[PDB]
């Protein structure tokens, strides 16, 4: 019973997807460049907010109130879903101020991870044209990234396999 209307923030939030796993050096500079640009050129009308916690657990048709209080000692009450649920509406209040807001979420690495929720954000794709360039770009950082390079290829190839629509 999907309602014909859904509640979304007034101003569309902007989310940048890693060309590869966020929290790693190459991607981190890839989004910090955009963050510094939006901050500097567009000062006074755009607010930058960082979501350290998760944001992929935004559900609306699970239960009336899962873990309403922290004293219930429930499995869901002491879990992290309470803070993530509280993260949802602050985006709404920042949107109601007409000021453009971005989301620096370090967990979402695919558009489908944050597509069925009620945020409905603007997703920006930063990608390298070829994985051959990406491999040497990762190599340029140093020996530290050599260990996670292997898992860092799949975060790129699975993401680019996503349709561009």
């Amino acid at each position: 019973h999907v309602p014909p209307y859904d509640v979304v923030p007034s101003m569309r939030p902007v989310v940048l997807v890693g060309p590869s796993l966020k929290g790693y050096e190459v991607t981190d500079m890839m989004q910090k460049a955009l963050f510094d640009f939006l901050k500097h050129r567009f000062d006074g009308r755009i607010s930058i907010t960082r979501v350290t916690a998760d944001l992929s657990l935004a559900k609306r048709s699970v239960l009336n109130n899962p873990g309403k209080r922290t004293i219930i000692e429930r499995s869901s009450a002491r879990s992290s879903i309470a803070e993530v649920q509280s993260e949802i509406e602050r985006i709404f209040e920042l949107a109601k101020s007409l000021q453009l807001v971005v989301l620096d979420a370090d967990t979402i690495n695919h558009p489908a991870q944050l597509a069925k929720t009620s945020l409905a954000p603007i997703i920006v794709f930063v990608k390298v044209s070829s994985p051959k360039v990406l491999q040497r770009l990762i190599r340029s950082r140093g020996k530290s990234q050599m260990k996670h390079l292997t898992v860092q290829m799949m975060a790129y190839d699975k993401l680019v396999q996503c349709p561009p629509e």
Binding site: V128, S129, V133, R136, L137
Partner: protein, 48 residues
Amino acid sequence: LIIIGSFFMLNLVLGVLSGEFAKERERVENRRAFLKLRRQQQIERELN
């Protein structure tokens, strides 16, 4: 004697060599090597 046997012959040699080089360039192996070089150069540009 000079005109016929030294300038005309040089022109013939240059023409034949240029034709041979042009035919050699479009061979399969040279084409593959050039494609490899071009792809590497595109990779270096994107990397830069």
